[PDB]
Design an enzyme around this catalytic site. Structure first.
Site, PDB file in Angstrom:
ATOM      1  N   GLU A  74       0.818  -1.217   0.000  1.00  0.00           N
ATOM      2  CA  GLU A  74       0.000   0.000   0.000  1.00  0.00           C
ATOM      3  C   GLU A  74       0.859   1.277   0.000  1.00  0.00           C
ATOM      4  OE1 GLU A  74      -3.091   0.255  -0.722  1.00  0.00           O
ATOM      5  OE2 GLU A  74      -3.986  -1.656  -0.223  1.00  0.00           O
ATOM      6  N   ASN A 105      -7.655   8.779  -6.022  1.00  0.00           N
ATOM      7  CA  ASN A 105      -8.431   7.766  -6.758  1.00  0.00           C
ATOM      8  C   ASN A 105      -9.167   8.422  -7.912  1.00  0.00           C
ATOM      9  OD1 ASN A 105      -7.764   5.602  -4.888  1.00  0.00           O
ATOM     10  ND2 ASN A 105      -9.126   6.640  -3.426  1.00  0.00           N
ATOM     11  N   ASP A 135     -12.237   8.413  -8.587  1.00  0.00           N
ATOM     12  CA  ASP A 135     -13.509   8.957  -8.152  1.00  0.00           C
ATOM     13  C   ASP A 135     -13.317  10.268  -7.400  1.00  0.00           C
ATOM     14  OD1 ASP A 135     -12.433   7.991  -5.764  1.00  0.00           O
ATOM     15  OD2 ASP A 135     -14.293   7.137  -5.071  1.00  0.00           O
ATOM     16  N   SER A 146     -11.785  10.652  -4.588  1.00  0.00           N
ATOM     17  CA  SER A 146     -11.337  10.317  -3.217  1.00  0.00           C
ATOM     18  C   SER A 146      -9.789  10.225  -3.199  1.00  0.00           C
ATOM     19  CB  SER A 146     -11.989   9.035  -2.699  1.00  0.00           C
ATOM     20  OG  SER A 146     -11.550   7.881  -3.415  1.00  0.00           O
ATOM     21  N   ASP A 167      -6.470   8.173  -0.931  1.00  0.00           N
ATOM     22  CA  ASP A 167      -5.968   7.226   0.071  1.00  0.00           C
ATOM     23  C   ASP A 167      -4.752   7.799   0.769  1.00  0.00           C
ATOM     24  OD1 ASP A 167      -7.856   5.522  -1.204  1.00  0.00           O
ATOM     25  OD2 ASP A 167      -6.324   4.294  -2.066  1.00  0.00           O
ATOM     26  N   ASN A 217      -9.008   5.291   2.739  1.00  0.00           N
ATOM     27  CA  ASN A 217      -9.679   5.948   1.610  1.00  0.00           C
ATOM     28  C   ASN A 217     -10.641   7.001   2.155  1.00  0.00           C
ATOM     29  OD1 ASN A 217     -11.124   6.569  -0.642  1.00  0.00           O
ATOM     30  ND2 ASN A 217     -11.288   4.475  -1.437  1.00  0.00           N
ATOM     31  N   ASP A 271     -15.438  -4.519   8.972  1.00  0.00           N
ATOM     32  CA  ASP A 271     -16.615  -4.065   8.253  1.00  0.00           C
ATOM     33  C   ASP A 271     -17.332  -5.157   7.505  1.00  0.00           C
ATOM     34  OD1 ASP A 271     -18.212  -1.599   7.171  1.00  0.00           O
ATOM     35  OD2 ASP A 271     -17.618  -2.704   5.314  1.00  0.00           O
TER      36      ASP A 271
END
Ligand SMILES: [Cl-]
Ligand SMILES: [Cl-]
Ligand code: NA
Length: 129
Positions: A35, A46, A48, A50, A52, A59, A101
């Site tokens: 990562e 990202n 979209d 967003s 990270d 994110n 989650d």
């Protein structure tokens, strides 16, 4: 901060990530490696819109607030910038939430693609733990 490999493993263990939700320390280390390459300041935008953040590339879409991700949640209740500190506490607490989650460590695509089912133990090999 760029952590050393055994250095990070020990930080993760200290913060109780080892076997958290059944994931050995080597998984967490492998995940951090692919990562952020162990760099606490890593940010990656990202498609979209967003972003990270940090050692575990958390994110902004769901987990932290950066104030520039329209319609996103801040489920860890923290500035995404806190995810970029030398001290990994905030990244750890928030990763615990992610990994609970429902999907385990599959929430981290680098883990799924590059860590899952590999010799993850090797990531902690030689470490004083
Ligand atoms: Cl936002
Ligand atoms: Cl699981
Ligand atoms: Na957010």
């Amino acid at each position: 901060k760029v952590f050393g490999r055994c250095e990070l493993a020990a930080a993760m263990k200290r913060h109780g990530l080892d076997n958290y939700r059944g994931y050995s320390l080597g998984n967490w280390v492998c995940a951090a490696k692919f990562e952020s390459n162990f760099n606490t300041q890593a940010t990656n935008r990202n498609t979209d819109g967003s972003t990270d953040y940090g050692i575990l590339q958390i994110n902004s879409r769901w987990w932290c607030n950066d104030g520039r991700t329209p319609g996103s949640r801040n489920l860890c209740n923290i500035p995404c910038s806190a995810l970029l500190s030398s001290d990994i506490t905030a990244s750890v607490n928030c990763a615990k939430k992610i990994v609970s989650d429902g999907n385990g460590m599959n929430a981290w695509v680098a883990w799924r693609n590059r860590c899952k089912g590999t010799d993850v133990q090797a990531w902690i090999r030689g470490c004083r733990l």
